[PDB]
Amino acid sequence: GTSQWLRKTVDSAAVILFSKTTCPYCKKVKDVLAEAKIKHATIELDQLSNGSAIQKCLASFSKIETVPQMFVRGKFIGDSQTVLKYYSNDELAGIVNESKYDYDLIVIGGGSGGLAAGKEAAKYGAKTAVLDYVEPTPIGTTWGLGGTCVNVGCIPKKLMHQAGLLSHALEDAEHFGWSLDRSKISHNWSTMVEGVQSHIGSLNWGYKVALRDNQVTYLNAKGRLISPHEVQITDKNQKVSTITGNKIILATGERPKYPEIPGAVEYGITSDDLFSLPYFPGKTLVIGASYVALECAGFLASLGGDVTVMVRSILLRGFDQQMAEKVGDYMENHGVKFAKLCVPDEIKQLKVVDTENNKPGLLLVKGHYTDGKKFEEEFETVIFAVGREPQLSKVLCETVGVKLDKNGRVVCTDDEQTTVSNVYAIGDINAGKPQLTPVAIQAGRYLARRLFAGATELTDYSNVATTVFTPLEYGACGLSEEDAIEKYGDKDIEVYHSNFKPLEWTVAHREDNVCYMKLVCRKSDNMRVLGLHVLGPNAGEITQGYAVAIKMGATKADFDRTIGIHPTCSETFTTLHVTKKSGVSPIV
Amino acid sequence: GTSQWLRKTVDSAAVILFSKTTCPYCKKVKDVLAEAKIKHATIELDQLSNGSAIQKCLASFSKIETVPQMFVRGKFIGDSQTVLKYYSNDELAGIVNESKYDYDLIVIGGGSGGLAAGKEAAKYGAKTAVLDYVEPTPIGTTWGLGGTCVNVGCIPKKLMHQAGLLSHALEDAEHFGWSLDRSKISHNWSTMVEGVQSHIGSLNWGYKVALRDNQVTYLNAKGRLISPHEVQITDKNQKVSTITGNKIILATGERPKYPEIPGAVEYGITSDDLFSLPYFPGKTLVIGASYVALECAGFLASLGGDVTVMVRSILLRGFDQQMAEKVGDYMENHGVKFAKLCVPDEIKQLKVVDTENNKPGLLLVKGHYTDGKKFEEEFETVIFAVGREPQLSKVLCETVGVKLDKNGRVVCTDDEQTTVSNVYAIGDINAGKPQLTPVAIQAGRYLARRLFAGATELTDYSNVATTVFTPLEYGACGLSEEDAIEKYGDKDIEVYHSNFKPLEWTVAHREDNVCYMKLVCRKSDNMRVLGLHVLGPNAGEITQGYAVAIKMGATKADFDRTIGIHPTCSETFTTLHVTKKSGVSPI
Ligand SMILES: Cc1cc2nc3c(=O)[nH]c(=O)nc-3n(C[C@H](O)[C@H](O)[C@H](O)COP(=O)(O)OP(=O)(O)OC[C@H]3O[C@@H](n4cnc5c(N)ncnc54)[C@H](O)[C@@H]3O)c2cc1C
Ligand SMILES: Cc1cc2nc3c(=O)[nH]c(=O)nc-3n(C[C@H](O)[C@H](O)[C@H](O)COP(=O)(O)OP(=O)(O)OC[C@H]3O[C@@H](n4cnc5c(N)ncnc54)[C@H](O)[C@@H]3O)c2cc1C
Ligand SMILES: O=C(COc1ccc(F)cc1)N1CCCC1
Secondary structure (H helix, E strand, O other): OOOHHHHHHHHHHHOOEEOOOHHHHHHHHHHHHHHHOOOOEEEEEEHOOOOHHHHHHHHHHHOOOOOOOOEEEEEEEHHHHHHHHHHHHOOHHHHHHHOOOOOOEEEOOOOOHHHHHHHHHHHHHOOOEEEEOOOOOOOOOOOOOOHHHHHHHHHHHHHHHHHHHHHHHHHHHHHHOEEEOOOHEEEEEHHHHHHHHHHHHHHHHHHHHHHHHHEEEEEEEEEEEEEEOEEEOOOOOOOEEEEEEEEEEEOOOOOEEOOOOOOHHHOOOOOHHHHHOOOOOOOOEEEEEOOOHHHHHHHHHHHOOOEEEOOOOOOOOOOHHHHHHHHHHHHHOOEEEEEEEEEEEEEEEEHHHHEEOOOEEEEEEEEOOOOOEEEEEEEOEEEEOOOOOOOOHHHHHHHHHOOOOOOOOOOOOOOEEEEOEEEEEOOOHHHHOOOOOOHHHHHHHHHHHHHOOOOOOOOOOOOEEEOOOOOOEEEEEOOOHHHHHHOOOOHHHEEEEEEEOOHHHOOOOOOOOEEEEEEEEHHOOEEEEEEEEOOOOOHHHHHHHHHHHOOOOOOHHHHHOOOOOOOOHHOOOOOOOOOOOOOOOOOO | OOOHHHHHHHHOOOOOOOEEOOOOHHHHHHHHHOOOOOOOOEEHHHOOHHHHHHHHHHHHHHHOOOOOEEEEEEEEEEEEHHHHHHHHOOOHHHHHHHOOOOOEEEEOOHHHHHHHHHHHHHHOOOOEEEOOOOOOOOOOOOOOOOOOHHHOOHHHHHHHHHHHHHHHHHHHHOOOOOOOOOHHOOOOOHHHHHHHHHHHHHHHHHHHHHHHOOOOEEOOOOOEEEEEOEEEEOOOOOEEEEEEEEEEEEOOOOOEOOOOOHHHHHHOHHHHHHHOOOOOOOEEEEEEEOOOHHHHHHHHHHHHOOOEEEEEOOOOOOOOOOHHHHHHHHHHHHHOOEEEEEEEEEEEEEEEEEEEOOOOOOOEEEEEEOOOOOEEEEEEEEEEEOOOOHHHHEEOOOOOOOOOOOOEEOOOOOOOOOOOOOOOEEEEHHHHOOOHHHHHOOOOOHHHHHHHHOOOOOOOOOOEEEEEEOOOEEEEEOOOOOHHHHHHHHHEEEEEEEEEEEEOOOOOOOOOOOEEHHHHHEEOOEEEEEEEEEEOHHHHHHHHHHHHHHHOOOEEHHHOOOOOOOOHHHHHHHHHHHHOOOOOOOO
């Protein structure tokens, strides 16, 4: 066990020093490496349980059993006297830079996972390249470094959500004694977009600065893996060339899908276009029912828009369906219209977009309901949110041998390894994993540490908490109620639940029994909490801390013995007592 | 073991049925008691792993070893045939109402703890009385049923905090594209107070409705315990009388202190007066530095007031002092003035309060700094927040034998029992316990279940989380950093920390490096989390869920393996890495 870890660590590390914290000879070598600006990993044997056994295994590579020992790309370089000899004779820089490959690591994709992986690898001396290119949308929209979340995802959508939440803050302020009149206040779309885009631009710049300051080579170029160690790159002038790397990380993400109907690509838009749109969308149709669809519909309605959502079957497929229906009922009561059990057949253009005067066009949408009946209505903007997909055929030559699944995602081991030994995949293209930004960041950073610093820790993909930022937010961690009943049977499942009213909603005359929470528990396992669900303000702040407790195996008794913080929404979880089986009402 | 539990349970339960879920004779007795509207506890022997032993122990009381067995106030009443005989002969009602005392339980004090205890006891058949009386403040302020939190504490102060937070929401809205002009908008104090008091009135009414619907006797009267089972009551006509009870729960809470200086009682006010005050305080001095002092100074400044806080020594004594200083620095940067190392000597009246035109008076405050230099300034309102105290001399005759500590609070065992066997104390008057509303509620409910339903669960008072609702909020769970170092030594403590910026603050152009969080950990115990601290928006919502993990013994490794929710403030706890020992900047 120890021997195999040491072999794998020595072969893979770029520059690694085996050391002890108490040894002055180690301190002397550390100081030389820092002065020469040579970055490296360090393994302190006097701080590992089995450091005595490791010291003996090292002799299989160096034929010495003492410390310090320095290695470069799998080769023993020397002890203290020898390293200092190389430094004195100006031979050290040459030794640490010799490599079979141009780079120790090439990352294809400059988004959530890829930037995290590349920065972390460079910290241990890995010579690293990060490649990023943004293929424009059909109407030509493009953006800078940072990936989907930064440019056209979590960041702009939550900022637009906050703009929508502030409409209710304006209404509430009157009841708390402020002299404004909400009815004579309006919203300016382009002022909001300008501010959102200025924040995104600071993140684009910050990432380029971060990469430069970690000695990472940033190439704004499209990458394609043509053999296990060769990446073909194409730059902004269509100049083609080839770079080589020891380890490869695929981190190229996904893009929005369009339905195969006339007029969709020509006249509709997606979330890729919405967040920098130079005109207010006007009267808008959202086609789809994912969290992207509902989040976007919700803030457009809160900003004063006329919004309709076209739903093929159900809302939020894959989420707890009691909770999804409560989310949708709140939206319908607060201005969002729904065309239920309905799909589109074609989009016709009635007016072209007026780019000079900053106005949308006009469109006729024709479709039909599920029994046979018809749909026909005019809209200024049509947004498609019908799923996302990778296009790895562009990124990856099939002759390399990387196995994909039926959906086109990469099949990986539990340490992110593909079917080709030196190639790994992280983020949204890793098949079967939750498609979330903090998952991609944890996978990338943890992988870099295993490759270049001898770490062993794996990423844990189970019970990852979520939040849907609809006008009333929905946070969750663990199983839906239906999935728990399916897995264990109804007689083994107990559900505790309650409505609640935020104290902030009392003076503001908001609704009594719309916010709601539940704990789905397994009777035969000490009332283990299988899933937690909350519909209410600040649901992501509420949910996050409980995800640590669920990771640790919390039971209902653990929630009961913990005391609440008053007055908060979250404290309601600490005193739940009404079961669904009892039939007693959950209202306040 | 089992036999001592059964004897304690039978002795104090008001009406209790020993039962099995599968027995039709027990169901028949259950159905009779429901039809006669007789409330009772039930213990299902087949749901307990030592139910066999309990069944054998019952025979020491009843001479029988079968179920059902029904007891009333320590006396075996009968099996199935016997209970049904009493029912059809119209004898059962008188049997279940037979008592040595007027009440099974008398609760003195109708606040957070006392209302919770009384309602829960009544659910198991305990015949219960709740007494509540509100002694008026020096200027005459009084209020309704529900205690300090409901009327003059957590509820009105967080509603006024929300009114303050909405001032910054109005400012932020401009940057997110809304057309308003924040500088043209003003605040109306009386409109806010009217809405707050209308909510408080709905709570007063709701508690009276709840006690009526649980068959609890509510007496709006002052109570005094004059022997272990006798409570002297005085009503709103000064009519004095005596009621008796088996068990007594003391739950009378605390009231604000005043300093012993000329003019303090005559011309100043406390938080008891602030939340119903008919005029805006105007230019205000807050004397003190508790969480009550800083919360009130903070929302008054956000509502447009000219506010000064005069601090004897430090802010938030007993809380982590790095966090306390960050809290105070934020308030000073957003318009609260501080007179540091300073105490008041006297308050002089320059104008009487104008009750007609609804205006405060005017006062001259004289004081001094610790080096002897003088303080002298005029204010319209002076609010004292210099601590709170019980006054059990009024509640409790010294000859009853209930022992108090040096501060006048009740010395209790870990099951809330006083030195008098039938008398218990809960809430703020229980010596050594955290003085918080959810603690008082848990202690009262769990105590009622042990007295009247045979429960065994104790309240756990360790690692109870808190939140200070200052303009930037401060949430905490566990030890301060200085307490962790004093208990374990500096070399055994590691602290992980980071600044952060809420996404909501980016477009609004708020501060980059003011929000802050840290985890205080013990190296030799697998990096156990000893304390969690966060300064930022919605800090109580952030902190609550982590209190469950700390209760369960969370380590730094547990925080690391849990994945964040993005974009949130709370997720910053899942990726902390900078240690204070390393000297690396947390920005
Ligand atoms: C509208 C929306 C809202 C979202 N909101 C949230 C939220 O609130 N919370 C959350 O946790 N997640 C959210 N997500 C999901 C989150 O954005 C993704 O899970 C995350 O961005 C995935 O990161 P990644 O590294 O796998 O890919 P990406 O971030 O998509 O980065 C991949 C990058 O590689 C580039 N690339 C592609 N092909 C090549 C090539 N051949 N050569 C070079 N570069 C290439 C791409 O253009 C892109 O820049 C949201 C997503 C969307 C669409
Ligand atoms: C300004 C302020 C803000 C606070 N904010 C919070 C917060 O955000 N969160 C939190 O958890 N806690 C907060 N607290 C603390 C909380 O209010 C108390 O911990 C809680 O009210 C204690 O409950 P209790 O049952 O011990 O007493 P109380 O709620 O004070 O109830 C005791 C009742 O008994 C009455 N009484 C007294 N003597 C007699 C007698 N002889 N006969 C009959 N009745 C009598 C009293 O008048 C009162 O009605 C705050 C306190 C203050 C002052
Ligand atoms: O009363 C308290 C603290 O009380 C204790 C805390 C720890 C302890 F070991 C004992 C008592 N609080 C009221 C406001 C916030 C905290």
